[PDB]
C-alpha cells in the first residue's frame, strides 16, 4: 500500500511546495493568498489531476500522442504542454544552482550568513541582534543579494557569468543526464530514506519556528485575511497557479508518468491521498517560513511584510536564518541543502524524462532508431544548460523572476487547463468520459468530479484570466523595481510560445485537411477509435 | 420505486431465434450499465452479457459470445437481448439487473421471463 | 474465467443458532469486486453484501462477510426462519462474470 506511494509521490512533491508557496504566500500578503487557494483546490486541483491519471491510462501515450485519440482538432494541447515542460526544465534546475552553491558554502567552521565582517558586505550592516539599536540592512538578505546573487541593478545590466553558479548549473546537469541515461529511479533500498528524509526535515524546521519568541505575529500574519484590501487579481492567479503548478497538471509529464499506472487499483482514492499529502505539506511549510519571519520581526523591529525579499529568494533568507539558530549550525546547514536538493531533483528527473519520452514521439523512427538516444539526451540537457546560464548572469535574477512569473506560471496554465476541462466535458462529452471511466475503474466519475469538469474549472479559469486582463498591473522582483517594457513584452512571449499552440495547431490541421469546411471541422472533432 | 419488469420470453425450437425485452423505470435509465444474467431449470446462476452506460462497451459470455447480442434504447427506457440461434442448453429465467458500480453487486432485479427450447 | 465455488452446498440449521458459509475463487479476486446475493424460494435474487463486508440496505444486521484473494465467506449471527434462502458469491474483477455455486439453508 505504501510502496507505490512512497515510489511515485516524490516526482511532483518538490521545490513547488517547500520554495514557491512561501514566496508567493509572503508576496500576496500572507493569510488573503489562503482563500483562492483552496477554493482552487477543491474546485479545480484535485478533479483535474484526477482527470489527467485518466486520461495517461486510457491513451497509454504522451501528451503529443494522446490527445489524438480524443478530439484530433485540439492536439495542440500536447505542444502546449511540451513547451511548457521544456520551459520549466530550464529555470527550475537554476534553483538547485542557488541551492549547490550554499551547499558548498556551508563547509565552514561559520556560516557566511550569520555575519558580517566579510567582505562582500555593505558599510550599512548590522547584526540582526544590533539593529534594535533606518537604511540598515540584515546580514542573510546581503549575502543573499551580493555573495550567492551578486544582484545587478537591473534586467538591463546583465554583467558577468558568475563561474562558480555556472558550474554549478554543470554538475545539476551532469547529475540529470547521468541519471536519465543509466534509468536511475527510487526503486532501490534508498528510496526510504530519499522520500522520508525531506519530512523530517520539515518536522525539524517547523518545531524550529514555532518555538521561536515572534512565532506567534508570524502565524497571525499566516492565517488572518484582508478580505477588504488584497482581493486585487495578482491573488487569485497565483493561487490558481500555484495549484496548477505544483500538482504539475497541464505540464502532460503527469499523463506520461500516469501511462505506466495499473488499472487494478482505486485510482479515486489515491488521486485524493497524493493531493491531500502535497497540499498539506506546502501549508505546513507555510506555517515553517512564516513563523520564522515573525521572529525575523521580532528581532529587527520592522514589520512582518518588510523583513525579507517578496520574491523567489524567500526560502534561501528565511530557512538560512533558522539554521543559524539552532546548535551546530553548520551540520543543520548541509543537511538543510541536501535535503533541498535531493527534493529537487527527484523531480527533475521525472519531467526530464516526460519531456524526452514525449519529444521522440517527434521522430520515433530517428530519435528512437537506436543508440542515438543516448545522444538526444545530451543534447536536450545541453541545451537546457546553455539557456539557464542566462539566468546565472549578474542580472540573471530579473530573468529568472520573469520565467517564472510567465513561462510555466499564470495565464498559461489557466489557458490549458480551460482547453483540457473544455474539449473533455463539452467537445468529446462527459458522458462518454464518464463511461470511459466506468470501463477503466468501474464506477463512474460522480457529480463532483463532472461539475469541477463541466463549469467550475472553466469558470474559474476564464474568470481569473479575465480579471487580470481587466484589473491589470505589471510584475516586479521585489516591491520596488518595476521591468522595461521589453522585459515584459519578452515575458508575454514566453507565455504565449505555449498558449498560441492550441490555436495554430487547430489552423494546421484545418488547412491540411480535405473536404468541405464543416466536413472539416466535424471529421477532426470526432474521436479516432 | 425502482421497477424493471422482462417480457418476452417463450416457446422456441432448437436453433430458432428469440428477443427478449426488460423495461426500466424509476431510475435515468441511461446513466446506469445493464446487465443479463440466467438462472438454469438446475437453479444455478450464470451471466450473459452487459452493456455499458451509454453502450459503446459490452461484454460477453464465452458460451453465448458467438450468438447473443445485447442493445439498449434509451429514449424509450428498454434493455433489449437477442438470441439467434438457441441450443439445447439455452433454456433458462432470464433476469435483467442493473450493474453501475462493478464495487456494488447488482443493485436490483427484474421479475425474469422463462424461455423453453422443447 | 474465474471459477467460484461454495462450501456447504446444503445445510442443517435451526433457529437461533450460529451459521457460517464459504466462497472460493479459482483466482485471486479484489477485497472491492467480489458480492453476495440472497433469492428466496421462487423469487428474484437480491443484493445482500457488497464487499467483504458492506451489508447492503435491507440486510438484517446479525449478516456480516470476510474474506481477501483466493477466499471468502459469509456469517450469520443467530439465524431465524426469514433467512432460510440461497446465497451465491459473485466476483465482480473480470470479465466473464461469474457467481459461485449457492449454497441452500434448509431450516
Known amino acids: 500500500k505504501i510502496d507505490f506511494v512512497l515510489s511515485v509521490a516524490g516526482g511532483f512533491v518538490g521545490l513547488g511546495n517547500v520554495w514557491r508557496f512561501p514566496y508567493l504566500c509572503y508576496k500576496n500578503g500572507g493569510g488573503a493568498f489562503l482563500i483562492p487557494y483552496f477554493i482552487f483546490l477543491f474546485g479545480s486541483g484535485l478533479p483535474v489531476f484526477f482527470l489527467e491519471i485518466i486520461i495517461g491510462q486510457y491513451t497509454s501515450e504522451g501528451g503529443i500522442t494522446c490527445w489524438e485519440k480524443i478530439c484530433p482538432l485540439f492536439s495542440g494541447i500536447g505542444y502546449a504542454s511540451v513547451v511548457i515542460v521544456s520551459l520549466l526544465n530550464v529555470y527550475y534546475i537554476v534553483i538547485l544552482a542557488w541551492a549547490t552553491y550554499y551547499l558548498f558554502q556551508s563547509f565552514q567552521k561559520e556560516l557566511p550568513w550569520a555575519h558580517c565582517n566579510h567582505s562582500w558586505n555593505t558599510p550599512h550592516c548590522m547584526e540582526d541582534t544590533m539593529r534594535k539599536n533606518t537604511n540598515f540592512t540584515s546580514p542573510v538578505i546581503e549575502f543573499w543579494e551580493r555573495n550567492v546573487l551578486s544582484l545587478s541593478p537591473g534586467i538591463d545590466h546583465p554583467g558577468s557569468l558568475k563561474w562558480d553558479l555556472a558550474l554549478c548549473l554543470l554538475l545539476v546537469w551532469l547529475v540529470c543526464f547521468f541519471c536519465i541515461w543509466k534509468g536511475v529511479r527510487s526503486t532501490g533500498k534508498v528510496v526510504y530514506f530519499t522520500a522520508t528524509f525531506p519530512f523530517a526535515m520539515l518536522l525539524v524546521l517547523l518545531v524550529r519556528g514555532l518555538t521561536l519568541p515572534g512565532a506567534g505575529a508570524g502565524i497571525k500574519f499566516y492565517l488572518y485575511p484582508d478580505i477588504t484590501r488584497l482581493e486585487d487579481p495578482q491573488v487569485w492567479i497565483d493561487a490558481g497557479t500555484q495549484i496548477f503548478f505544483s500538482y504539475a497538471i497541464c505540464l502532460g509529464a503527469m499523463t506520461s508518468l500516469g501511462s505506466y499506472n495499473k488499472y487494478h487499483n482505486n485510482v479515486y482514492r489515491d488521486c485524493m491521498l497524493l493531493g491531500c499529502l502535497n497540499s498539506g505539506t506546502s501549508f505546513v511549510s507555510g506555517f515553517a517560513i512564516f513563523s520564522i519571519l515573525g521572529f525575523m520581526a521580532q528581532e529587527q523591529g520592522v514589520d512582518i511584510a518588510d523583513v525579507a525579499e517578496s520574491g523567489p529568494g524567500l526560502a534561501f533568507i528565511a530557512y538560512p536564518k533558522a539554521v543559524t539558530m539552532m546548535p551546530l549550525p553548520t551540520f543543520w546547514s548541509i543537511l538543510f541543502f541536501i535535503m533541498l536538493l535531493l527534493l529537487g531533483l527527484d523531480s527533475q528527473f521525472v519531467e526530464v524524462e516526460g519531456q524526452i519520452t514525449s519529444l521522440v514521439d517527434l521522430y520515433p523512427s530517428f530519435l528512437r532508431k537506436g543508440y542515438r538516444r543516448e545522444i538526444f539526451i545530451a543534447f536536450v540537457c545541453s541545451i537546457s544548460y546553455l539557456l539557464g546560464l542566462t539566468m546565472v548572469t549578474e542580472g540573471g535574477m530579473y530573468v529568472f523572476q520573469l520565467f517564472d512569473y510567465y513561462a510555466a506560471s499564470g495565464v498559461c496554465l489557466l489557458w490549458v487547463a480551460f482547453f483540457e476541462c473544455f474539449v473533455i466535458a463539452w467537445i468529446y462529452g462527459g458522458n462518454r468520459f464518464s463511461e470511459d471511466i466506468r470501463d477503466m475503474i468501474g464506477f463512474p466519475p460522480g457529480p463532483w468530479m463532472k461539475y469541477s469538469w463541466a463549469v467550475i474549472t472553466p469558470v474559474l479559469c476564464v474568470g481569473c484570466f479575465i480579471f487580470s486582463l481587466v484589473k491589470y498591473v505589471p510584475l516586479t522582483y521585489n516591491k520596488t523595481y518595476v521591468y522595461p517594457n521589453w522585459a515584459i513584452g519578452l515575458g508575454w512571449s514566453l507565455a504565449l510560445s505555449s498558449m498560441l499552440c492550441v490555436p495554430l495547431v487547430i489552423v494546421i490541421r484545418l488547412c491540411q485537411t480535405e473536404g468541405p469546411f464543416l466536413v472539416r471541422v466535424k471529421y477532426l472533432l470526432t474521436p479516432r477509435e | 420505486e425502482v421497477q424493471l419488469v422482462e417480457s418476452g420470453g417463450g416457446l422456441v425450437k432448437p436453433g430458432g431465434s428469440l428477443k427478449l425485452s426488460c423495461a426500466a423505470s424509476?431510475?435515468?435509465?441511461?446513466?446506469?450499465?445493464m446487465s443479463w444474467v440466467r438462472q438454469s431449470p438446475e437453479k444455478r446462476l450464470e451471466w450473459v452479457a452487459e452493456?455499458?452506460?451509454?453502450?459503446?462497451?459490452?461484454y460477453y459470455s464465452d458460451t453465448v459470445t458467438g450468438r447473443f447480442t445485447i442493445s439498449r434504447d434509451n429514449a424509450r427506457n428498454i434493455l433489449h437481448l437477442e438470441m439467434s440461434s438457441l441450443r439445447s442448453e439455452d433454456t433458462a429465467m432470464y433476469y435483467c439487473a442493473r450493474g453501475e458500480v462493478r464495487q456494488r453487486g447488482f443493485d436490483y432485479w427484474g421479475q425474469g421471463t422463462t424461455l423453453t427450447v422443447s | 474465467e474465474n471459477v467460484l465455488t461454495q462450501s456447504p452446498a446444503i445445510m442443517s440449521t435451526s433457529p437461533g443458532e450460529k451459521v457460517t458459509m464459504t466462497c472460493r475463487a479459482s483466482?485471486?479476486?479484489?477485497?472491492?469486486?467480489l458480492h453476495w446475493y440472497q433469492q428466496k424460494s421462487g423469487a428474484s435474487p437480491k443484493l445482500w453484501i457488497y464487499s467483504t463486508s458492506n451489508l447492503a440496505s435491507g440486510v438484517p444486521a446479525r449478516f456480516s462477510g470476510s474474506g481477501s484473494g483466493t477466499s471468502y465467506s459469509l456469517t450469520i449471527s443467530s439465524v431465524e426462519a426469514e433467512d432460510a434462502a440461497t446465497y451465491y458469491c459473485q466476483q465482480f474483477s473480470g470479465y466473464p462474470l461469474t457467481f459461485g455455486s449457492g449454497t441452500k439453508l434448509e431450516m
Open positions: 424509476g431510475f435515468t435509465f441511461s446513466s446506469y450499465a
Open positions: 483466482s485471486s479476486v479484489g477485497s472491492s469486486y
Open positions: 452493456i455499458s452506460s451509454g453502450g459503446r462497451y459490452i
